[PDB]
Curated annotation (Swiss-Prot):
It is found in: Nucleus matrix. This is Matrin-3. The gene is Matr3. There is a cross-link at residues 8, 17, 21, 45, 52, 84-85 (Glycyl lysine isopeptide (Lys-Gly) (interchain with G-Cter in SUMO2)). The chain holds residues 478 to 576 of 846 of the full protein. Part of a complex consisting of SFPQ, NONO and MATR3. Interacts with AGO1 and AGO2. Part of a complex composed at least of ASH2L, EMSY, HCFC1, HSPA8, CCAR2, MATR3, MKI67, RBBP5, TUBB2A, WDR5 and ZNF335; this complex may have a histone H3-specific methyltransferase activity. Interacts with TARDBP. Part of the HDP-RNP complex composed of at least HEXIM1, PRKDC, XRCC5, XRCC6, paraspeckle proteins (SFPQ, NONO, PSPC1, RBM14, and MATR3) and NEAT1 RNA. Interacts with FUS. Interacts with IGF2BP1. Interacts with IGF2BP2 and IGF2BP3. Interacts with RBPMS. Coiled coil: none annotated. May play a role in transcription or may interact with other nuclear matrix proteins to form the internal fibrogranular network. In association with the SFPQ-NONO heteromer may play a role in nuclear retention of defective RNAs. Plays a role in the regulation of DNA virus-mediated innate immune response by assembling into the HDP-RNP complex, a complex that serves as a platform for IRF3 phosphorylation and subsequent innate immune response activation through the cGAS-STING pathway. The modification N6-acetyllysine is found at residues 52, 101. Residues 26-101 form the RRM domain. The modification Phosphoserine is found at residues 39, 41, 63. It comes from the Eukaryota.
Length: 112
């Protein structure tokens, strides 16, 4: 998932939305993540029993990760399950909220 030289995962910039009706990008944004040398799974486990992880992003830069569930429902159930119950990961009150950025974690605007 990179075409340059070495180490180029964390890169990009913001944008301005235009439309949103016939599409529903499901991307679970995980903030305040730990850093005890854990594996990516440890971050997907909170989504595994929620939905099929079609794509995931483990960003250690600013301690953040983006997990794209298989269906909007799942992802939605996660961020919600955090409202009623406190989601604890590895012993941390990690924040799980749905983000708009990216639709499936890939970056590839069609030629429409």
């Amino acid at each position: 998932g990179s075409s340059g030289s070495s180490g180029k995962k964390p890169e990009g910039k913001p944008d301005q939305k235009f439309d949103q009706k016939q599409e529903l990008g499901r991307v679970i944004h995980l903030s305040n993540l730990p850093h005890s040398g854990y594996s990516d799974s440890a971050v997907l486990k909170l989504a595994e029993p929620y939905g099929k992880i079609k794509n995931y992003i483990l960003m250690r830069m600013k301690s953040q990760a983006f997990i794209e569930m298989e269906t909007r429902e799942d992802a939605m159930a996660m961020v919600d399950h955090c409202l009623k119950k406190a989601l604890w990961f590895q012993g941390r009150c990690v924040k799980v909220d749905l983000s708009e950025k990216y639709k499936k974690l890939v970056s590839g605007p069609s030629s429409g």
